[PDB]
């Protein structure tokens with residue numbers, strides 16, 4: 001059987017919030033079976049715990065944000081994908097500030113942090129949500145969908161309206177593997193365009209992004225002196241982003257997902273729409289690693 005997993009040791013990392021621009025300390029600790037991913041604000045008296053679920057997501061404004069009343073934990077998506085990517089089922093996440101550190105803009109620093117600390121298996125079957133029939137959501141020109149697949153597949157397609165793209169639209173379609181996630185999806189940095197970036201900073205918003213942790217794009221070309229990590233970088237990241245928001249289902253998925261100019265808002269939207277469609281899904285666990293159609297990096 002495929003067992004649930006956790007962290008073998010404690011990991012600490014410190015950086016800044018892209019949006020908040022405040023220094024923050026992130027500590028990851030192992031948690032028990034059936035726990036899931038819990039975000040904790042440990043600078044507050046008493047400490048405020050927001051479990052990472054679809055129903056705790058309030059704000060989808062250029063970041064995924066969990067809300068418990070007037071306390072919020074901001075920009076959760078990258079870390080939750082690293083954890084989705086390496087298959088961390090249960091871990092305690094503790095923040096000194098409201099927003100999670102942007103690191104170098106990818107899920108890469110968290111992968112390197114989790115790979116070094118190590119994975120621990122647990123005596124409990126790992127629950128999966130299996131997609132029985134197609135579920136969809138539309139919002140104007142943006143679209144998102146869950147469809148059956150024997151494994152996990154994320155396909156994506158985006159109509160960026162920028163000169164750098166050469167009038168073309170971007171498309172990537174990944175088959176989920178630990179190896180598949182690390183080598184081709186994990187290092188896809190976040191991107192900023194100069195038009196959107198100007199109005200945020202003058203208002204002391206998005207003060208945290210720079211060449212050091214993001215892609216700063218001007219009309220003429222990508223200003224970062226070493227260009228793109230992948231030829232494919234922008235669209236892969238949007239895949240890095242979707243994996244992180246879907247994992248607020250609280251369980252791993254066994255279906256193909258397709259996004260078309262889909263964002264945080266729609267990603268959270270499909271989850272709730274899915275859960276409501278009980279006929280749409282069932283829970284499944286696996287007796288053998290072979291029976292199971294998904295391979296995670298062995299502990």
Ligand SMILES: C[C@H](O)c1nccn1Cc1cc(-c2ccccc2)on1
Pocket residue numbers: 018062063075077078189190191192193197200206207208209210214215237241
């Ligand atoms: C935040 C989300 O995970 C993301 N990844 C890539 C792009 N995005 C959207 C996004 C990008 C920015 C941004 C803000 C200021 C500077 C650079 C970038 O803020 N939200």
Ligand SMILES: [Zn+2]
Pocket residue numbers: 077078190237241
């Ligand atoms: Zn992102």
